[PDB]
Amino acid sequence: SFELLHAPATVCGPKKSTNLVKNKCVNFNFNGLKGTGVLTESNKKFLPFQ
Amino acid sequence: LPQGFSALEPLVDLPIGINITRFQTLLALHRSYLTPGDSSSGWTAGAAAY
Numbered sequence: 205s206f207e208l209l210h211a212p213a214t215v216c217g218p219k220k221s222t223n224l225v226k227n228k229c230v231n232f233n234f235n236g237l238k239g240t241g242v243l244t245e246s247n248k249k250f251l252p253f254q
Numbered sequence: 255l256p257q258g259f260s261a262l263e264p265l266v267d268l269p270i271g272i273n274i275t276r277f278q279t280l281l282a283l284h285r286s287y288l289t290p291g292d293s294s295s296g297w298t299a300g301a302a303a304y
């Protein structure tokens with residue numbers, strides 16, 4: 205049975221992962237934000253929640 | 255409150271979706287032999303403030 209309620213959903217299970225490439229101009233969707241650029245390694249360290 | 259500065263980082267995120275108007279804080283009391291009495295008077299609290 206499917207319930208529709210006035211609340212955000214909790215179960216969707218998208219999955220469908222993909223490998224990684226570096227130093228190549230590729231399209232990326234890391235968590236939901238799109239872009240078109242190249243990837244590399246950065247020295248700055250994020251805070252744990254960033 | 256000391257005269258200082260400090261930032262608050264996020265802890266949790268609850269997708270609840272209810273209506274909130276009021277709240278109440280709880281407390282933990284202690285009952286020992288040094289505070290005789292029944293369940294309504296025989297307890298000790300401790301030093302605290304908020």
Ligand SMILES: *[C@@H]1O[C@H](CO)[C@@H](O)[C@H](O)[C@H]1NC(C)=O
Nearest residue numbers: 209210211271272273274275
């Ligand atoms: C409770 O919150 C809902 C939001 O979905 C709102 O529509 C409603 O007016 C609020 N108050 C109630 C149900 O008394």
